[PDB]
């Protein structure tokens, strides 16, 4: 809490206090970007902020669209997530890194808020309710999660060994659903099952354990 600010719009408050709370939430963190430091921002329950946007307009005699959300709701989440940046050298070199949270409606990737925020943001982390009960905690989807900048965005010693981690995980997700025959043929259709399963049992951890 020494190095943490928290703006907290509850559900028992009005709509525009929830509508402004990620906007005021990035107003704090632009100061940390302006004066050279680095800033972390998490826009938690950003779909519920968009429902807080949908309440105000539909009382305001404004035309609705997809799922009765208004027209400009892309522009809401656009400038909410464009003001986080990494400045040049000429203004301190400060940064902002963005965590929006979008809850899918039990698996609608084509949900209206989802298609906006998956197209704005740079990398996504899928957390299905499938992977959360197979022991994988935190339940990251590997084949569906992409980033942009790749190298020089990880630990550089990790960066060399990550290609040995990702590509072996790439074949393993293809052979895991082929376990309906009992094949384990030619010491490869068993070993990539033997490798990637321990990779899943590698890559679990505990809640609230920063390592």
């Amino acid at each position: 809490m020494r190095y943490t600010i928290m703006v907290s719009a509850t559900a028992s408050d009005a709509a525009p206090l929830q509508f402004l709370a990620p906007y005021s939430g990035c107003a704090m963190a632009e100061y940390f970007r302006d004066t050279g430091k680095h800033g972390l921002i998490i826009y938690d329950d950003l779909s519920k902020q968009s429902v807080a946007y949908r309440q105000m307009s539909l009382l305001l005699r404004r035309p609705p669209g997809r799922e009765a959300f208004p027209g400009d709701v892309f522009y809401l989440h656009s400038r909410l997530l464009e003001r986080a940046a990494k400045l040049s050298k000429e203004l301190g070199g400060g940064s902002l890194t963005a965590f929006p949270v979008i809850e899918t409606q039990a698996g609608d990737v084509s949900a209206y808020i989802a298609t906006n925020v998956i197209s704005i943001t740079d990398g996504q982390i899928f957390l299905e309710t499938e992977l959360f009960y197979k022991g994988i905690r935190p339940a990251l989807n590997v084949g569906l999660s992409v980033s942009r900048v790749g190298s020089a965005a990880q630990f550089p010693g990790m960066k060399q060994v990550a290609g040995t981690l990702k590509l072996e995980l790439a074949q393993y997700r293809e052979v895991a659903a082929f376990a309906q025959f009992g094949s384990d043929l030619d010491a490869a259709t068993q070993y990539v099952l033997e490798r990637g399963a321990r990779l899943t049992e590698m890559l679990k951890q505990k809640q609230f354990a920063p390592i």
Binding site: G65, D72, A114, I120
Partner: protein, 383 residues
């Protein structure tokens, strides 16, 4: 003479006039604002009132503030000095190097080039990607489309196509940023100063590109007309100069979305699923201005974000009629770890015919289509 803003509803504002109302698609200016604000009229309300669209944010317009008439459409400064410049929708420098070293301002709203001045001679544009040049061969002066989901690799194909064709041409090109991220905007500015397409100093006149940027931060007035601002400077270099210019427009879908965000706000009923009722004349008016005539050549390169790999939405389903060469990106081939994840079935161009290229090109690409369709019809039964 001049009028006042009478009504503000979000990003559309209403200006009343005392006689001699402005023509449609003209430019308006408000004084006393923070930045110069351009209002582009889209419909007449009826009671001496034009209804506008806002090139920047309206937060600050008082009711009754002074609004002058420029009596004319949006004017961007076109010219040879505009190369090496990062350009706005309304003609501004946003790279912070003085004014635009150019003259002869031009109306960015016009009619399409007519049917008589149409080019039918087709030349294969060899790019350098083994799935493009074999399967979906592009056309010199023709249209290049790029579909695919958010996270399949559309924009990293586009800068790869710049390094392929926009460097080995020598002439001029134009990058028309329509509502993409600033991250893929700012990074392209660095990787064209280092690659030497855009220069700084006193060598500004030998460069090869202008950047017309209407990225995601702007309100949808700017994201809806940066497509046209990037277009007309490409059509300025075509008719006056004669050079072939490569238009690299990014997120044509964001052009159609920026229209659709306020199309309901101008008093129109929504169309199919919630997109705009007038998408046909919005996109069809956009596309057929981008052609190649007898006078010059424009080779359009179009990237389109499609939502969740569904081609049944009518906002990209109007675009499929409007693109000769189409490079449809599947997320499945990227989930296989294959880059570029270009569909062997969905991506098909118009050059692919033995009556133009030759039978040695058409038969292997068709031979690719036999072995890859049956591979899809067998990988269901291989499980």
């Amino acid at each position: 003479d001049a009028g006042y803003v009478s009504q503000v509803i979000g990003p559309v504002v209403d200006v009343r006039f005392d006689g001699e109302l402005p023509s449609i698609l003209s430019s308006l200016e408000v004084e006393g604002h923070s930045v110069r604000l351009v209002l582009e009229v889209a419909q007449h309300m009826g009671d001496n009132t034009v209804r506008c669209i806002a090139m920047d944010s309206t937060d600050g317009l008082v009711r009754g503030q002074k609004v002058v008439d420029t009596g004319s459409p949006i004017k961007v400064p076109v010219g040879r000095g505009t190369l090496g410049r990062i350009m706005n929708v309304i003609g501004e420098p946003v790279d912070e190097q003085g004014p635009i070293d150019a003259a002869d301002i031009w109306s960015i709203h016009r009619e399409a080039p007519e049917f008589t001045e149409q080019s039918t001679e087709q030349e294969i544009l060899v790019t350098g990607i083994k799935v493009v040049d074999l399967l979906a061969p592009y056309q010199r002066g023709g249209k290049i489309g790029l579909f695919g989901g958010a996270g399949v690799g559309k924009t990293v194909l586009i800068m790869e196509l710049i390094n392929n064709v926009a460097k080995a041409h020598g002439g001029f090109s134009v990058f028309a940023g329509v509502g993409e991220r600033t991250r893929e905007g700012n990074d392209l500015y660095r990787e064209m100063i280092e690659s030497g397409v855009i220069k700084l100093g006193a060598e500004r006149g030998n460069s090869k590109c202008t950047l017309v940027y209407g990225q995601m931060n702007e309100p949808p007035g700017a994201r809806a007309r940066v497509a046209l601002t990037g277009l007309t400077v490409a059509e300025y270099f075509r008719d006056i100069e004669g050079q072939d210019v490569l238009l690299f427009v990014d997120n044509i879908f964001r052009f159609t979305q920026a229209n659709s965000e306020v199309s309901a706000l101008l008093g129109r009923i929504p169309s199919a699923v919630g997109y705009q009722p007038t998408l046909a004349t919005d996109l069809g008016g956009l596309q057929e201005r981008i052609t190649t005539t007898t006078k010059g050549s424009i080779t359009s390169v179009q990237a389109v974000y499609v939502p969740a790999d569904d081609l049944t939405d009518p906002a990209p389903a109007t675009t499929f009629a409007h693109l000769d060469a189409t490079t449809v990106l599947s997320r499945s081939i990227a989930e296989l770890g294959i880059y570029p994840a270009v569909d062997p079935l969905d991506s098909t161009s118009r050059m692919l015919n033995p009556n133009v290229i030759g039978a040695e090109h058409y038969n292997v690409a068709r031979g690719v289509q036999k072995v890859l369709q049956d591979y899809k019809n067998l990988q269901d039964i291989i499980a």
